Amino acid sequence: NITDDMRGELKNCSFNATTELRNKRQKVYSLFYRLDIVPMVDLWTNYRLINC
Amino acid sequence: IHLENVTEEFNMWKNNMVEQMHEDIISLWDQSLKPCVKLTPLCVTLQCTNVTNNITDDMRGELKNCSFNATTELRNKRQKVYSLFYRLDIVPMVDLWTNYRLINC
Amino acid sequence: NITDDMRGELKNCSFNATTELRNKRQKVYSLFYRLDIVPMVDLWTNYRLINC
Amino acid sequence: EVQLVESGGGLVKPGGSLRLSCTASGFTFSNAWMSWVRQAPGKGLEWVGRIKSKTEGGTTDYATPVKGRFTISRDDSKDTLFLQMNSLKTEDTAVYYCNTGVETYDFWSGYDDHYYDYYFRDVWGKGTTVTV
Amino acid sequence: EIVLTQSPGTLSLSPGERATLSCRASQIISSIYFAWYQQKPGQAPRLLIYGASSRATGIPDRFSGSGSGTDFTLTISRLEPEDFAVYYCQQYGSSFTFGPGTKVDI
Ligand SMILES: *[C@@H]1O[C@H](CO[C@@H]2O[C@H](CO)[C@@H](O[C@@H]3O[C@H](CO[C@H]4O[C@H](CO[C@H]5O[C@H](CO)[C@@H](O)[C@H](O)[C@@H]5O)[C@@H](O)[C@H](O[C@H]5O[C@H](CO)[C@@H](O)[C@H](O)[C@@H]5O)[C@@H]4O)[C@@H](O)[C@H](O[C@H]4O[C@H](CO)[C@@H](O)[C@H](O)[C@@H]4O)[C@@H]3O)[C@H](O)[C@H]2NC(C)=O)[C@@H](O)[C@H](O)[C@H]1NC(C)=O
Ligand SMILES: *[C@@H]1O[C@H](CO)[C@@H](O[C@@H]2O[C@H](CO)[C@@H](O[C@@H]3O[C@H](CO)[C@@H](O)[C@H](O)[C@@H]3O)[C@H](O)[C@H]2NC(C)=O)[C@H](O)[C@H]1NC(C)=O
Ligand SMILES: *[C@@H]1O[C@H](CO)[C@@H](O[C@@H]2O[C@H](CO)[C@@H](O)[C@H](O)[C@H]2NC(C)=O)[C@H](O)[C@H]1NC(C)=O
Ligand SMILES: *[C@@H]1O[C@H](CO)[C@@H](O[C@@H]2O[C@H](CO)[C@@H](O)[C@H](O)[C@H]2NC(C)=O)[C@H](O)[C@H]1NC(C)=O
Ligand SMILES: *[C@@H]1O[C@H](CO)[C@@H](O)[C@H](O)[C@H]1NC(C)=O
Ligand SMILES: *[C@@H]1O[C@H](CO)[C@@H](O)[C@H](O)[C@H]1NC(C)=O
Ligand SMILES: *[C@@H]1O[C@H](CO)[C@@H](O)[C@H](O)[C@H]1NC(C)=O
Ligand SMILES: *[C@@H]1O[C@H](CO)[C@@H](O)[C@H](O)[C@H]1NC(C)=O
Ligand SMILES: *[C@@H]1O[C@H](CO)[C@@H](O)[C@H](O)[C@H]1NC(C)=O
Ligand SMILES: *[C@@H]1O[C@H](CO)[C@@H](O)[C@H](O)[C@H]1NC(C)=O
């Protein structure tokens, strides 16, 4: 339940994170503020972190 | 210098020479490892089985024959390595295609 | 257009480089001096950098 | 050695209840999605339903003909999958099996996802019965 | 629900021959959701091919296949004794139904 003022301010993103072992990956689901991410290469749902 | 007629009070446990020795030994220990290899490529799943030798009861089991895929000089190459580990250096986790990982990963 | 004195001095090398993102890759090629690379695994085209 | 240890089946009548279950062996279930498929004697394979891990959120999916009377749940903590049946029809005799997919990615380096050996294991239980 | 049918219902090929099987979805379900199993009688089914392409772990390289909309195919390059089983295709179109089962015989 998002008020009008917050529409588009938060995004629910899913990424593959590294793990304790070098050969393993995990799947993490976190909330981000819109200001910290940037959409990329003409893909509707694909984002990267602002400063990579 | 003998100090023939000097009597003085000593109090070990409140002696700050101890703390300086403590800090310098630890600091030197850490400095000696600064230029050494960091074994981060080795925090991988292992495949551990028993040792193919004559093992006495006092050694049962104490040692394990572990294989793993190690990195190598080039990033697009990988190698099979196996080695012996003491049971105390590994933990019986992972439970995937493989059995065990290194204690401090 | 290579003069006689330069034959064998330069090579055109292609490789797969990392990118800003851990899950994205790029094809890169560049020119190298022969003195900076070494042949490997008995392949006419397979070279690596001298200091790996 | 991914195994599903299936048990709890037996001789029941429609006017009753039955819970079938599978327990992990070798490889765990908190990190796996599981489903049930049944095959009545003389019939092909019919999907009953699928439940996801409590991670994505224990969400379930069921085939139309089995809804309501056949439900699915998970414990996850004890690695056990359940098929819960109540008030069954005379049409429900079948051998029920549990199954899971195992998607394992062996990465060559902790710095570049370009290099890995990927393996996909399809694992089935032995089959237990629901009767009429 | 999702309805899959198979053809021919029974195949009659000698070991060493190419025992190609085909099946059809009534619904147009993308090939990414396609799977093809082999069920030895009395046994749980075993996945051969998923994504109408990729081979499952353990599965011999004599197995391959393809498909698109409703039209799917399974190839056994050479039939072997291990293949005399009933085959099922499955479509994960939000209801993971299967065909009736196709017998490979001689
Ligand atoms: C983080 O990592 C994530 C990893 O997820 C993986 O994604 C890759 C694609 O990137 C998939 O690889 C592709 O799979 C195709 C076939 O898979 C289909 O069938 C699977 C079967 O499982 C089913 O049956 C089981 C029983 O038999 C049952 O237990 C199970 O519950 C299920 O019903 C499906 O799981 C699979 O779905 C997944 O993949 C889809 C994309 O294909 C996704 O949209 C979906 O969300 C699932 O992740 C699918 O239906 C296969 O055809 C592809 O082959 C291609 O590449 C081959 C070479 O690699 C090539 O030879 C082929 O010709 C073809 O080009 C490919 O192998 C993995 O299967 C999938 N793993 C999982 C979890 O299933 C990634 O998804 C995520 O994006 C990453 N996150 C970020 C942000 O980067
Ligand atoms: C290091 O990397 C190699 C290569 O990726 C891994 O090799 C793998 O070894 C396992 C165990 O033998 C193989 O499993 C076997 O698979 C066949 C079907 O492929 C199955 O019939 C057997 O019963 C068994 O499950 C696996 O396929 C094989 N992979 C390949 C492509 O060679 C090795 O395990 C890795 N070692 C570690 C410690 O990670
Ligand atoms: C640990 O396991 C390795 C295999 O991964 C053993 O090495 C093999 O030993 C046989 C003889 O028994 C040789 O024929 C193979 O050529 C060896 N393979 C490799 C890669 O060296 C090793 O002997 C085992 N060690 C112990 C102590 O059990
Ligand atoms: C960069 O990566 C591509 C793959 O994305 C390499 O191309 C593959 O090379 C192998 C042989 O090593 C072939 O079996 C594959 O069929 C090729 N795949 C594709 C899509 O072409 C390419 O060789 C790599 N570049 C360099 C310089 O090594
Ligand atoms: C979310 O908003 C809808 C109205 O759009 C309302 O009916 C619903 O109860 C709200 N949910 C919560 C948790 O407040
Ligand atoms: C998601 O947010 C974007 C603005 O960033 C908006 O255009 C889009 O309609 C929203 N979609 C939904 C389902 O709310
Ligand atoms: C292990 O002990 C047996 C005697 O019980 C002996 O014959 C064999 O050679 C020994 N193996 C090794 C590796 O020492
Ligand atoms: C390996 O050693 C352990 C501990 O001594 C023992 O319990 C186990 O049975 C042995 N397994 C094999 C295959 O020798
Ligand atoms: C490159 O060398 C050829 C002779 O091998 C010559 O004919 C050509 O004109 C040269 N290219 C240019 C741009 O001069
Ligand atoms: C590359 O140049 C060297 C030196 O002139 C020559 O011996 C070799 O045959 C050339 N190879 C190719 C593929 O042109």
PDB file of C-alpha atoms in Angstrom, chain D residues 6 9-10 18 20 37-44 46 48 70 83 85 88-97 127-132:
ATOM      1  CA  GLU D   6       8.946 -41.890   0.525  1.00  0.00           C
ATOM      2  CA  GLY D   9       1.148 -44.994   2.055  1.00  0.00           C
ATOM      3  CA  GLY D  10      -1.243 -47.883   2.473  1.00  0.00           C
ATOM      4  CA  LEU D  18      -4.167 -40.118   4.154  1.00  0.00           C
ATOM      5  CA  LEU D  20       1.976 -39.261   2.100  1.00  0.00           C
ATOM      6  CA  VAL D  37       2.549 -36.964  -9.797  1.00  0.00           C
ATOM      7  CA  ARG D  38       0.227 -39.941  -9.742  1.00  0.00           C
ATOM      8  CA  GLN D  39      -0.341 -42.868 -12.004  1.00  0.00           C
ATOM      9  CA  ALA D  40      -3.448 -44.964 -11.723  1.00  0.00           C
ATOM     10  CA  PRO D  41      -2.943 -48.522 -12.974  1.00  0.00           C
ATOM     11  CA  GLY D  42      -3.443 -48.527 -16.746  1.00  0.00           C
ATOM     12  CA  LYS D  43      -3.105 -44.730 -16.936  1.00  0.00           C
ATOM     13  CA  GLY D  44      -0.482 -42.186 -17.916  1.00  0.00           C
ATOM     14  CA  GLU D  46      -1.012 -37.031 -13.986  1.00  0.00           C
ATOM     15  CA  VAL D  48      -1.295 -33.443  -8.836  1.00  0.00           C
ATOM     16  CA  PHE D  70      -5.570 -32.908  -2.342  1.00  0.00           C
ATOM     17  CA  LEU D  83       0.610 -34.664   0.281  1.00  0.00           C
ATOM     18  CA  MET D  85      -5.613 -36.061   1.334  1.00  0.00           C
ATOM     19  CA  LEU D  88     -11.260 -38.662  -1.684  1.00  0.00           C
ATOM     20  CA  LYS D  89     -13.110 -39.897  -4.721  1.00  0.00           C
ATOM     21  CA  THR D  90     -13.374 -43.383  -6.148  1.00  0.00           C
ATOM     22  CA  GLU D  91     -11.266 -42.059  -9.018  1.00  0.00           C
ATOM     23  CA  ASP D  92      -8.174 -41.441  -6.833  1.00  0.00           C
ATOM     24  CA  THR D  93      -6.430 -44.850  -6.672  1.00  0.00           C
ATOM     25  CA  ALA D  94      -2.925 -44.432  -7.961  1.00  0.00           C
ATOM     26  CA  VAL D  95       0.717 -44.749  -7.230  1.00  0.00           C
ATOM     27  CA  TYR D  96       1.892 -41.347  -6.133  1.00  0.00           C
ATOM     28  CA  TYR D  97       5.448 -40.231  -6.522  1.00  0.00           C
ATOM     29  CA  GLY D 127       6.095 -44.537  -5.382  1.00  0.00           C
ATOM     30  CA  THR D 128       3.491 -45.206  -2.647  1.00  0.00           C
ATOM     31  CA  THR D 129      -0.247 -45.746  -2.831  1.00  0.00           C
ATOM     32  CA  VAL D 130      -3.557 -44.124  -2.297  1.00  0.00           C
ATOM     33  CA  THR D 131      -6.410 -46.553  -2.652  1.00  0.00           C
ATOM     34  CA  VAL D 132     -10.227 -46.931  -3.011  1.00  0.00           C
TER      35      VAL D 132
END
